[PDB]
Antibody, heavy 219, light 218 residues
């Protein structure tokens, strides 16, 4: 299958340089356009430009002439976006998108790379259990969770049981506190009879602080 | 400057009904070569956009026949017949007839469904957190519609203001409900000065408000 897998989230200071990657697989890399699109928070998609991997030539939209560059590592089937002299307006999710030139469209997209430009240092989350609502001997449904508290910047990743538990899971949007730091909870509902057999571990990953935590959630 | 304008911004539609999203460009998308390069993408919650329709009326592979685009020149429409819960997200039109490629601003398709009451759960602070010097109490409202919900905190029967935050999920891709967290945060010392912690929920699906509570230390 066609896949475009981008690199992870970044935190940068104003004036620094960020280089984002997008590894292509499943097609002849050199025969399709590689486009870059920006999505700032709550905003419409903006086309930034493309690089032609057949010829190495770059073309940019008006707003993206200057601090922006595109690069290719053809042997590695990887395309890169570089932004130099980072400003707060650059805080956005950036997508690579394959251009199918035969109908001039963006038929496959990468998953997005989040970049936060900030003067502030990263802070890793503390992870706390939200312990099961009921006991087994009175049945029905029980809720349980993890509180992912006091981190910067966005995003965090939360899975349950290393991705094996997905049904019933709600990871809430992050909210800011007056501290300037994010918190969120992730909850799951389960049969209360399974609390005595099944163990439940939330796996939290905050890449900008290199925090990886597994937390067992029990009574 | 080539402007693409979508209307409406938000479109609520019931399951099984027809959704209709308009896209208008400031210049004609008919290329001197003969083609009209007007496309549609769908971006669901947290995800990358996905290719839906190309050159006005052509469905991308895997796109069901209930999606259909039409129009010519400057005015185009995407129609979703028999809307399903999985069709939730932001629809974007795009043009690449004129350099440079541009997107419209997006239309958020919302699903209207029947009222659904929340299941309510209260969670006291972990021991681990209290040892860290703070106390968060979490109230969960799970699987409700509509989104509107009133959640009050009482600590020893005193109404709390100014010390809680709410967060709400996007509509569920299978049953079109929402869930909400309310988090009451206090210092460990304030927390330990009171016994009863209660959250009270008022919602269209409930004939009277539901309270969940716990007594501290138990």
């Amino acid at each position: 299958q066609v896949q475009l897998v981008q690199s992870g989230p970044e935190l940068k200071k104003p004036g620094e340089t960020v280089k984002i990657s997008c590894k292509a697989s499943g097609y002849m890399f050199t025969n399709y356009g590689m486009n870059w699109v920006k999505q700032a928070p709550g905003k419409a998609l903006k086309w930034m430009g493309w690089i032609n991997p057949y010829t190495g030539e770059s073309t940019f939209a008006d707003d993206f002439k200057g601090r922006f560059a595109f690069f290719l590592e053809t042997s590695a089937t990887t395309a890169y976006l570089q932004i130099n002299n980072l400003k707060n307006e650059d805080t956005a999710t950036y997508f690579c998108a394959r251009g199918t030139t035969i109908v001039r469209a963006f038929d496959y997209w990468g998953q997005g790379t989040s970049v936060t430009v900030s003067s502030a240092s990263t802070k890793g989350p503390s992870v706390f259990p939200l312990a099961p609502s009921s006991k087994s001997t009175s049945g029905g449904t029980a809720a349980l969770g993890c509180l992912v508290k006091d981190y910067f910047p966005e995003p965090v990743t939360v899975s349950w049981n290393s991705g094996a538990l997905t049904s019933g899971v709600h990871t809430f949007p992050a909210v800011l506190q007056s501290s300037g730091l994010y918190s969120l909870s992730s909850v799951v509902t389960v049969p209360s009879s399974s609390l005595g057999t099944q163990t439940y571990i939330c796996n939290v990953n905050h890449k900008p602080s290199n925090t990886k935590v597994d937390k067992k959630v029990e009574p | 400057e080539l402007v693409m304008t979508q209307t409406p911004l938000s479109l609520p539609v019931s399951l099984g009904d027809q959704a209709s999203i308009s896209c208008r460009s400031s210049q004609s998308l008919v290329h001197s070569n003969g083609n009209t390069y007007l496309h549609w993408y769908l971006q669901k919650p947290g995800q990358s956009p996905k290719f839906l329709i190309y050159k006005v009326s052509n469905r991308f592979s895997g796109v069901p026949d209930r999606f259909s685009g039409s129009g010519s020149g400057t005015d185009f429409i995407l129609k979703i017949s028999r809307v399903e819960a999985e069709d939730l997200g932001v629809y974007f039109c795009s043009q690449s007839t004129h350099f440079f490629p541009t997107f419209g601003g997006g239309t958020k398709l919302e699903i209207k469904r029947t009222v659904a009451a929340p299941s309510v759960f209260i969670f006291p602070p972990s021991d681990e957190q209290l040892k860290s010097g703070t106390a968060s109490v979490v109230c969960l409202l799970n699987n409700f519609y509509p989104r509107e919900a009133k959640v009050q905190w009482k600590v020893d029967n005193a109404l709390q203001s100014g010390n809680s935050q709410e967060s709400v999920t996007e509509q569920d891709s299978k049953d079109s409900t929402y869930s909400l967290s309310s988090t009451l945060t206090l210092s460990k010392a304030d927390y330990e000065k009171h016994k009863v912690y209660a959250c009270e929920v008022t919602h269209q699906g409930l004939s009277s408000p539901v309270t969940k509570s716990f007594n501290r230390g138990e």
